[PDB]
Every structure is written in structure tokens, then in C-alpha cells.
Nucleic acid binder design. Structure first.
Lengths: 81, 91, 92, 108, 94, 78
DNA sequence: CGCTCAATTGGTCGTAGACAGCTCTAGCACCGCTTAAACGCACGTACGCGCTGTCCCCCGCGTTTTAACCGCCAAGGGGATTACTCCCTAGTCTCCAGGCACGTGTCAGATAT
DNA sequence: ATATCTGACACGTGCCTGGAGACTAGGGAGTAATCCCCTTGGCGGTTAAAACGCGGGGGACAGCGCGTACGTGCGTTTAAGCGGTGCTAGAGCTGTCTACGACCAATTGAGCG
């Protein structure tokens, strides 16, 4: 059992940094990367909860994320909405 | 050598698939949900859509980061050289 | 009850250029997003263009003005060329 | 009173003007709706769809593929800045990103 | 003779909302730029100088954190390529 | 005549923005950046006017242009 | 400074999942003929806030010599990548458990046909 | 009074949802050599700065108009509607082939000679 955000692994951030097109990776980056990711989920999931609770539902749908991303301008295809 | 990492870039651009491990992402998502409101269950595809949208945010952040380091005459990333993004973009 | 989407119309328009080409459901889902995203952009713009002039009808000239503001290039007048053809031949 | 036809058939369009009229009306966008509007809108949907699908065909053909996948549409967009200025606020699910190395990073 | 401690403009132009471009040359500018779409227009004097305000506020927005980008590059001196950084990150030129 | 945006006008604007050093090769390309910004907000604004059959470029139509980049302002009839 | 040879790549075996025509079914939303009210055109008629020049000082450019500075190669070691080292939790998968909308319950009545 | 129907008063499984467990092994992690990168400094090499007197044109004053504005008659338009009737999705299982990979000789890279 481990809750401590490490599920965002070194191997994962390494590969994301690769796909973004960046080279050498000094070890200071990983904990700051986890932070910005948290803040982005804490923007989106907040409004996804408002979509779930507008219907008074007990489960988050793909629509509930999609319209939250849409109203926050970082729009997404492939899931309806 | 210390540098076949450049061929990693091209290989991880030949690839397109999501990079974070599934259950590990779901744990982080649930541990952001369960102290925000009561007992949020999630349909699998919604969690996947969150994962794609967030990995896209990070790939875009690193693309901007390459510009930040390269424009600072570096071919290496450092945290300050990410931190231009949050103040220049809008957040 | 039915899902509602655009799959057969996008797969029709695909034959307008590439009858040799097949589709994955995932790509069909991308196009089923792109279609109604253009709808979301235009219909709101036309309703706003009507509202900016207090009107009870969105109109041909409203959509023409919305599309004139949708793409910053030749594609706007190409879209206008297709739309003027459509409205002309429908009403003649 | 006779066997029916879509308005699109008189318009010279293949896209379905009638459900566009429905989507406007169910969309509640105004008290009335000029019939010219959905007729023109169907042509927007065709012209903007065909243009990107053609380039999607190019991306697939050049990668020697025969079934379209999101990769092809993403690369079709990044090959054309007139599409990039539309879709820059948009993510193509599972297409990844344009394969690109900036020249400063290369060997020698 | 040389300058020294060059802060004197910083302690003026951020103290009040003064307007920085002169009217008539900007007036012909927007008008001569408009007519390449459509001539025989008429132009509200309010409408053109409201665009002068928007252009000036946007020009604050074209330096304010653009000079921070040079500071990230460790130049105190802005160079044209800085715009090609900052303005690409804002998405206004690609 | 784009040259009516003079050197001291851009000095003043940048010094409201708090700038220190420039290299003189900045300004002539930055005039081009303002030229394309200014052209974009003009063509969008004038379109609403001419579409509404008015020939007079209306300050409402300047607001409705800046509003499409989200840069809202009041007093001009909003 | 061109060779040896290790490191990614490309053709053949064969297999197996997600398209593409189902396959009419068919459940229904598009069109036709009506019914129909009202807004925006078409259009006078009010007419300003647009376009259009003399006197008068200011707004911008050109010139003084020069260094803050960027870019230079000089100086300067750390810590990331690569690599092989082991230790472990992602994914898998099969069985658990419990929620919803259901048809008929079962019997019999709050409300009145 | 009468027929009957209408909630108390409720043990009967699919579909669905999410949970938690043990093994396997894909892979995360652990440690370290050591190169190659960020680097740490200062003129030395190259160019922004108010003038300082000076040229380029913007502005306080006048002076006319078909535009920009109301707001009535009305006719053309869509609203709204119900039947008829051409459309679109279900789900069922092909008929696959196309994409999926592993095996097994090509092309791209590290070492100094």
C-alpha cells in the first residue's frame, strides 16, 4: 500500500518529457511535474463534479469530464460532447 | 555517448499511446476525488479521457519547456525553465 | 432509445475523395466530434450575430457572417462558395 | 401529397439539412430560424469535413495504411496551418503529436 | 551625459492611464488598413481611438512578461527572437 | 503609412510595461507585429458593420471584435 | 576517419478483432399540406458626427561618444545517462457481492364508478 | 350496493456496477563509472542612450451632408402542427484483412588507428 502520488513514476515523466521533445532530465523536475498535474486535475475534476451533481448522480461519466474540459477551453474529441 | 536519448525522442514520437500506468493514474484520481466530495465512482472511459487530456497538457508543457531551455541556450531542462509556462500562458 | 451521431454522413463524405479507405471506430469518434464542434461554433456565432442586431431569426446572412469569422483564410470564402451554391439551388 | 425527398437533394448537398434544422430548434438558438441558415450550414459541414479527410487519406497512404486511425487525422492537421489555427485548442485522442526534432538538439 | 539610474519613465507611465500614440496618424493607419477589405466606409472617431486604447493595452501585454522571457534567457536586453518565443507560447503566430 | 507608429511611442509603451534594455533591431519587426494585430482587430470589427449594412464602423463592432478574443471593455455601448 | 562489429530495422508465417454489410427490422423524425402571427423589409423622413481646410508649437528624428552588455573562449566538476545491478507491484483473471428496473407477486379497498 | 382496481406489504434473477485476492513476470528501482554539460568569469568586441538643436506633422479653431437614426404598412416568412412515410441503429455474425507480432538478414553507430 502507498498513497504518496509516486504512481506518477520516474519512468512515466521521463517518457512524457521525451514525447514533448526534451533531452537531459535533472532530478529536481519530477516533484514539480506532479504538482502542475495535480493543479490541472483540480481544475477539471472540480467542474466534472459540478456536472455529476447537476444531475445529482453518484458516478462520473465521460460527458462529465468532456464538458468540464470544454468550458475550461482545453477541448477534447473522441468521447462525444 | 550519453545521448541516444535523442533516438528515444523519435521513438516516443513514433509511439502515440498513453504513457502512465492505468491503476496508478486511477489511484491518484480517486485520492483527489474522495476528500473533495463523497464516494465518487468513475466509468473507466472517463478516467481514460482524464488521463489523455492530462498527458496532452504535460506533452504541451514539455514542448514549451524545450523552447524555454533552448532559448536559454540549454539542451537540458530545469524547474525554473518550466516555471515560465504558468506565468506566461495564463494560469 | 438511440445514441444519435453522424457516422454514416462522415463515411459518405469519405467516399467523396477516398473510396479505397477504411475507418476505425476511434477515428469515426474523432469525426463525430469535429462535425458537432463546427455546429457548436457556427450556431452560437449566428445566434450572437442575430442578438448583436436584436433579431428573432438567425439567417443566411448571419451564417455567412459567422463562417466569414470561422477561418482566417481562403477556406472561409471556399465555405461561402459551397453555402451560396447550396442556398441558391435549394431556393431556385 | 407524394413520396418524400430531403431538402438537400434540391440544394445539391449530401448532408442532412433537416436534422440541422432540428439541432438548431432543439438547440433553442432563436425564436425563428431562416431556412437559408441550415441549408448553408450543411455545406459548411461537408466542405470542412472533406478537406481534412483528403489530408487524412494522404497521411494514411504515405504511412502505407488502409484503415484510418486518429494518428492520420492528427498528422493531416499538423501538415496544414489553416487547420492548425482551428484545432490548436483541440486534442486528437490517441493520435499523439507531430514527430519533430529541433535542429539545435541534433548530433554534430 | 551618459545616463545613470534610468528609472524616471517607470515612475511616470505606470502612475496614470495616459494615451501614448497621437490621433491623426493612427486614424489614417486603421482606415488605410481597413479599405483593403472594403472602401467607402465611414469611421466613428470613438471606434478608432478605442482600438488605439486596445492596441496600447495589448502593447503593454507585448512587453510586460516578454522582457521576463529574456530574463529567463539571461538577457536584460530584449531581442526579436524573444517575441518568437513568448508569442509562440501564447499561440498567436503558429 | 504604418511608419506613424514612431520610436518614442514604442519606448513609452514598453516603459509603461516596465522594460529595461532593447537592441534597436527590435522596433522595425515589432511595428510588423502591431500591424498584423491591428489589421486582425480591424477586419473582424468592420465585418459586423458592413454585414449590418451600416457603412459607419461602429464602436459596438469594435467591442464585438475584441470580445471574440475575450478582451471585453465597457462605455462603448456594452 | 575506414574499417569491425554491435545495435534498429524490414520481409515472411500465421493468427485473431474490429470493422463493414448487414438485415430487415422498424421506431420514428423529415417533409406536405395545412393552419397561422408578427418582424423585418421596404421606406419615407428626421438631419449629426461624419468628412473637409488656416494658424501655431509641439512630436520625432539626426547628431555628440560611449559600456552596459552579449557573445566569446577562457576558466571551472556533478550528476544524468547508460548500463547492469535486483526487488517489486501492474496487470491480469476469476470469483465475490450488491443495485436497478423488472413482472407478476399477494390480497385486498382509500376513493369513488 | 356495486364492480373493480389499486399500495403495504413484498423473497424471486438478468443485466449492470465496483472489489479484493494470489501469481507471474515486465518493469520499476539501486547503484555506480564516468563524460559531457552546464558551465563561472571579464574584457573585449560591438552597439542604446537623452539630448541639443532641430525638422516633420498634429492639433484648436471653423463648416457642409447623406449618411445614421426612428417607427408605420404590410407580406412574406417561419411557427407550429399531424399524418405518412423515407430515414437511421441494433445487433446479430459473418467475412474477413488488416493490423498484430516473432523470427531472422538488412542498415546505423562507437572505437582510433
Amino acid at each position: 500500500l502507498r498513497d504518496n502520488i509516486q504512481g506518477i513514476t520516474k519512468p512515466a515523466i521521463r517518457r512524457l518529457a521525451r514525447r514533448g521533445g526534451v533531452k537531459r532530465i535533472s532530478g529536481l523536475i519530477y516533484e514539480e511535474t506532479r504538482g502542475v498535474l495535480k493543479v490541472f486535475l483540480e481544475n477539471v475534476i472540480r467542474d466534472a463534479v459540478t456536472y455529476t451533481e447537476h444531475a445529482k448522480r453518484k458516478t462520473v461519466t465521460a460527458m462529465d469530464v468532456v464538458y468540464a474540459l470544454k468550458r475550461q477551453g482545453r477541448t477534447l474529441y473522441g468521447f462525444g460532447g | 555517448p550519453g545521448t541516444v536519448a535523442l533516438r528515444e525522442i523519435r521513438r516516443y514520437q513514433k509511439s502515440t499511446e498513453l504513457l502512465i500506468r492505468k491503476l496508478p493514474f486511477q489511484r491518484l484520481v480517486r485520492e483527489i476525488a474522495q476528500d473533495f466530495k463523497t464516494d465518487l465512482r468513475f466509468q473507466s472511459s472517463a478516467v481514460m479521457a482524464l488521463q489523455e487530456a492530462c498527458e496532452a497538457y504535460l506533452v504541451g508543457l514539455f514542448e514549451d519547456t524545450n523552447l524555454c531551455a533552448i532559448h536559454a541556450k540549454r539542451v537540458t531542462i530545469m524547474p525554473k525553465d518550466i516555471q515560465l509556462a504558468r506565468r506566461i500562458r495564463g494560469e | 432509445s438511440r445514441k444519435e451521431s453522424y457516422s454514416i454522413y462522415v463515411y459518405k463524405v469519405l467516399k467523396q475523395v477516398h473510396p479505397d479507405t477504411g475507418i476505425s471506430s476511434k477515428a469515426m469518434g474523432i469525426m463525430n466530434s469535429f462535425v458537432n464542434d463546427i455546429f457548436e461554433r457556427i450556431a452560437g456565432e449566428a445566434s450572437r450575430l442575430a442578438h448583436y442586431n436584436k433579431r428573432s431569426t438567425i439567417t443566411s446572412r448571419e451564417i455567412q457572417t459567422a463562417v466569414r469569422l470561422l477561418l482566417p483564410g481562403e477556406l472561409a470564402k471556399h465555405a461561402v462558395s459551397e453555402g451560396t451554391k447550396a442556398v441558391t439551388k435549394y431556393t431556385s | 401529397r407524394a413520396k418524400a425527398k430531403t431538402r438537400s437533394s434540391r440544394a445539391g448537398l449530401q448532408f442532412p439539412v433537416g436534422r440541422v434544422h432540428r439541432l438548431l430548434r432543439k438547440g433553442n438558438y432563436s425564436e425563428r430560424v431562416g431556412a437559408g441558415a441550415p441549408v448553408y450550414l450543411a455545406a459548411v459541414l461537408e466542405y470542412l469535413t472533406a478537406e481534412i479527410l483528403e489530408l487524412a487519406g494522404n497521411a494514411a497512404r504515405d504511412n502505407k495504411k488502409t484503415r484510418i486511425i486518429p494518428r492520420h487525422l492528427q498528422l493531416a492537421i499538423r501538415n496544414d496551418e489553416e487547420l492548425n489555427k482551428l484545432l490548436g485548442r483541440v486534442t486528437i485522442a490517441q493520435g499523439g503529436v507531430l514527430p519533430n526534432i529541433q535542429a539545435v538538439l541534433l548530433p554534430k
